[PDB]
Symmetry: C3
Subunit: 389 residues, 3 copies
């Protein structure tokens, strides 16, 4: 029947988001030095396990409640939906993983991941996605969803939340040793396994297909448009950054091109079900250019992001959320809302996400760092995070 086919589609899409977890692991492990890559991989597995435990235990009840230790219910599609949203929560915290590499303590990162899976992501996902339970009859939406905020697959719910928490963490722990100098400016710390980073980017593209396809929530002939918009956004982001770099040398332009692919994917994540192919290409290309410029701006601002989580997930998420109101069809809006009123509503969603997913983690992680330091000692950072803290 229709319900069985929809259930298998959501299960295969959750499998694709597990592929996206593997791609995040490869992307982050290949972009760091060989003395820190094993710690990065251990972080990338540990946050996934901790977030799955936290979302099964209380995260699903916080995000979609009126749930705790989720068992079988009367709703047929709710188990597949729960698995998909658990994969989404793991995606948010493994976004947080990549920015804090090579200088953050493992237990402090585990505490940050617990904060992300316990309080920040379920509350904002309840605000933006409260009434989006798959197959449920009577679901009360969140206040942001009631006001008219639209996020198809989570450019704000998943990517911007992780970007804001990652920005707060890298502002609190500070930059790596030997990265920024007062005399010589900015030094580049290249990774040691950049082909693994390219493989991780391809796996992230593959997982992004499942992200958008399972966030579609139904099965008809227009899901192929969502897949085509996904492919065009990612490839046009990569193509635009490739055109910008063009004659720049390898081992530095590859990071920009892969970040452009990922940022184009982050931008089409907001509106993959409501835009055309030309709109998806335009949004992805502008997102890739914005990721390039935001990486340069973060380098000049002395903010150390190792894999450029903020130019990809945060800047791309804000651009995709704002470009939904510029490019999507008016039939997907609330009736009576024009193109500027929807821009005000999506800007309100961006500002609310910024306040809740940055300011509250900034105070909480600052208070945690005041009594429990999250930056390793300098001998650990020189020796490497593979060898203990």
């Amino acid at each position: 029947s229709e319900s069985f086919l929809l259930n298998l589609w959501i299960l295969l899409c959750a499998c694709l988001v597990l592929i996206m977890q593997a791609g995040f692991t490869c992307f982050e492990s290949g972009n760091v030095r060989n003395k820190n890559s094993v710690n990065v991989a251990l972080k990338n597995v540990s946050d996934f396990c901790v977030c799955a435990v936290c979302y099964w235990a209380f995260g699903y009840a916080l995000m979609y409640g009126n749930g705790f230790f989720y068992s079988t219910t009367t709703n047929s599609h709710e188990t597949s939906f729960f698995l998909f949203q658990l994969m989404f929560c793991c995606t948010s915290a493994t976004i947080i993983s990549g920015a804090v590499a090579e200088r953050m303590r493992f237990t402090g990162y585990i505490l940050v991941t617990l904060l992300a899976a316990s309080l920040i992501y379920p509350l904002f996902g309840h605000w933006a996605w409260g009434g989006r339970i798959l197959g449920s009859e009577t679901s009360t939406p969140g206040w942001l969803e009631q006001l008219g905020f639209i996020d198809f697959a989570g450019a704000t719910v998943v990517h911007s939340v992780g970007g804001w928490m990652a920005l707060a963490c890298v502002l609190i722990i500070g930059p790596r040793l030997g990265r920024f100098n007062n005399k010589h400016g900015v030094n580049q710390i290249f990774g040691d396994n950049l082909p693994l980073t390219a493989l991780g980017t391809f796996l992230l593209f593959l997982g992004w297909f499942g992200f958008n396809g399972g966030s579609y929530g139904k099965i008809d002939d227009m899901l192929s448009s969502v897949f085509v918009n996904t492919a065009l956004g990612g490839t046009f982001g990569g193509f635009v950054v490739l055109l910008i770099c063009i004659w720049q040398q390898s081992l530095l332009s590859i990071r920009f091109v892969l970040n452009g692919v990922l940022a184009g994917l982050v931008a089409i994540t907001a509106s993959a079900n409501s835009i055309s192919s030309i709109d998806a290409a335009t949004i992805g290309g502008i997102s890739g250019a914005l990721s390039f410029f935001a990486t340069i701006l973060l380098e000049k601002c002395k903010i150390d992001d190792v894999v450029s989580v903020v130019p990809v997930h945060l800047i791309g998420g804000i651009w995709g959320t704002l470009a939904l109101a510029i490019f999507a069809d008016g039939q997907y809006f609330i009736a009576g809302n024009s193109r500027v009123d929807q821009f005000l509503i999506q800007l309100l969603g961006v500002v609310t996400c910024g306040i809740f997913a940055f300011g509250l983690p900034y105070m909480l992680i600052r208070l945690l760092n005041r009594v429990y330091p999250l930056r390793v000692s300098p001998r650990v950072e020189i020796l490497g995070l593979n060898f203990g803290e």
Copy 2:
């Protein structure tokens, strides 16, 4: 119709078990030294090819016969079923591969893989799964299946069999050079590509989803419960080992955490269709703890398992097989069988698997080693298995 959707589901699940082969290759290649990783990858491809040839030629006919060089039949679901069981047969010997790394001859490993795919796995799969032909009308079950032994996805048929012959092989060829010494105790040989082991573990999780989903054998609303039990078992195994290690340093605790993920998956493999989410979490966590203690016990017993096949596949398989009778619902048992009679039956299956998949390979591989030595010369083990034997 129903048959076409079921056939596509089994084909996609067999694709996921091919992903599981790729994850096994990455997990075993990253966990060894750089002078042996190419030989490990060559073993991981060659055993897959040899097992596929053997199962197409005679393995399917021995496992599910009343077949030889399988062609198209009248049964609609039996071709996808054959592909799925072929990938299961490849999974057993690629479990066998990881235990015998860095000191075993390539041709001797090919002979061991031929033994596994020719005699041991098809005969025990006929004993435990003989009547489980997908879509067939009249199928006579094996004697173990007729007695009441329940094994959903191969915790005994796949994982315990490969664990037993891997244990026999590492007992016959002996430990690696410079691994156990009489004076200073136990020395650790760390791998050189541990992020590739993390990627392999993620691919193994993803393929484990297909393992359980294709072993479900039907399509209804309860397959998402099987997927949720798979995710919760793997993540709770990893979470429990992470809680045990907590403050232990990296480059050694990552192996324990990934082994806990895999062992939790091995334990839920036995009963993923018959337990609740809390039961899946409990079984996976106990399996991860048991993998940790079994790795320690194998280190104290001077038994060299390179990637810890025995604590993951054998110990986890025995625990999952025994925990089916502790945790699963009584409606899945034979009518009239209580909770202790089922424990006796599953213990009989464990003992039968131990006898047939250990004692017969131990005598056969010992007789082969007496006339054809399966351990490399010491200059090959010092120089590396990438450079010939």
Copy 3:
């Protein structure tokens, strides 16, 4: 309905061909030296992005027109079909990527990829596959397709075209430095990440399943035969090359074994929907042996192919195209065509593919190389292509 399930099948198959792109990236990045692998990964992402942009812009209109900047149409299956064929075009140019590694300039490779995605692949795909639009009512076939040429999944359209322009490129730019010498003959340049080539080969097998399954074009009970033929062709190619090598040392035989797997897949690609399992095994084994002999012949002919694109894709593609007329059932031919007439037609298709995909790219790339050199300077080849050109 049937249309929704077919659309989801084509979307999942296009996801599998994206996995094939990832596997190609791993296979080429692991087979080169560490001073060139980052440039190889950058090429493997850049050609994918450029080809997706080119096929969305004008490639689909040239291949399947009577389309430019493809948007939503009346045909329900055409969007998933477009995504699948875009994946096929990206597959052709990423076949081209692997032959020209370690000595070709990046911008010159981008121009070659533009030539492949703009002129060669869409025109030959229009000639061979012009009337194969999924779900269309009135589609005029190409002249080769009207003459009776059969290519199920593109052993000639995808693999032979990429092999021919890869051969033209490596004949124009020439061999690597320190590869062939007049005194000592042939020297071997081993890659530095051969386990990553094993992972890439497994990912290529996985995506090759999706290649054949989405090229099937319908859903019934005979798609499982296509999957079984795919598995048997790949595994028998690997098994035959493993039997040929047997006692040869590692670090060189693994390249032959993986190339045999891939070449068996290339040969079954032509006729996976029309042969038996024994025929698939025979075709795959002969293709693996032919890849081994063609690799030896290319090393004796002083033609430097880094990952052996020509023995795998070109020789395997020609063998699969010719073996369709030897092994497939007569019901799949044009009525009135015998077994020798179909051999003449498939040979005409092979000769037409050779002329159009070799002689025109050889002339165009020679004219481009006369005014714009595509081979790096010797200091760039000595230092490495990761550090600029």
